[PDB]
Amino acid sequence: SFWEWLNAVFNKVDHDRIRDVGPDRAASEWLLRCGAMVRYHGQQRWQKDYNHLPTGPLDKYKIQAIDATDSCIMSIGFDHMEGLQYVEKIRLCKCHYIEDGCLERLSQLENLQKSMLEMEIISCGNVTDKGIIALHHFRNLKYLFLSDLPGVKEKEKIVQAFKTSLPSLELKLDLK
């Protein structure tokens, strides 16, 4: 369908673009075109309008936090995360196209395993226990907030899993 093609091309990585402007800028463009927001290290304010992303020096701004609320990010789109070195915080909220495979993809990026401190996954209806468990590879995670994930059916097992694999994790669960 047209709409499927459109979502795919919103997500698809342009590796020329990564070469030209660097991973953080290329990922910022992906996220904002897909309805997400980013915040750079050293800045208080968020980037929320694509057209206002900075044009100041090449590869200077580094993503610290991502807030993808009501966003069409999915699957291959997350390949834009591969070159990012400093991402500490990700919120995925009402990301209706995200699935376990998206979380798996993220969890396998060693760059994210090194940097990630906080993750929030809220009202992403496809996510299941499988996708959540994959997040144990984020070995430095300090905060994980899960909310309104009806596909997550065994929350007590999730708690016990993380209690072993990430004993210092603050795990906040608002799950039925």
Q: Which residues of 69-99 are buried (b: 16+ CB within 10 A; e: fewer)?
A: eebbbbbebbbbbeebeebbbbbbbebebbb
101: contact with Mg ion by CB under 5 A: no
131 token code pair: 């996708």
**Beta carbon of residue 148, minimum distance to Mg ion (angstroms, whole number):** 17
Choose the binding region for Mg ion from 62-70, 94-102, 125-133, 163-171 (rule: CB under 5 A): 62-70
35: contact with Mg ion by CB under 5 A: yes
69: contact with Mg ion by CB under 5 A: yes
**Beta carbon of residue 34, minimum distance to Mg ion (angstroms, whole number):** 8
70: contact with Mg ion by CB under 5 A: yes
Contact 127/121 with Cβ under 8 angstroms? yes
With H, G, I as helix, E, B as strand and everything else as coil, classify residue 143. Answer: strand
Nearer to Mg ion, 29 or 104 (CB): 29
7 phi/psi in degrees, rounded to 5: -60, -40
Determine the size of the site formed for Mg ion (CB under 5 A): 3
The DSSP code for 68 is: E
- What is the enclosing helix (H) or strand (E) of 102? helix 100-107
Choose the binding region for Mg ion from 29-37, 88-96, 127-135, 157-165 (rule: CB under 5 A): 29-37
104 phi/psi in degrees, rounded to 5: -60, -45
Nearer to Mg ion, 48 or 136 (CB): 48
77 among annotated binding-site residues: no
Choose the binding region for Mg ion from 4-12, 26-34, 65-73, 103-111 (rule: CB under 5 A): 65-73
69 among annotated binding-site residues: yes
Residues near Mg ion (CB under 5 A) are 35, 69-70
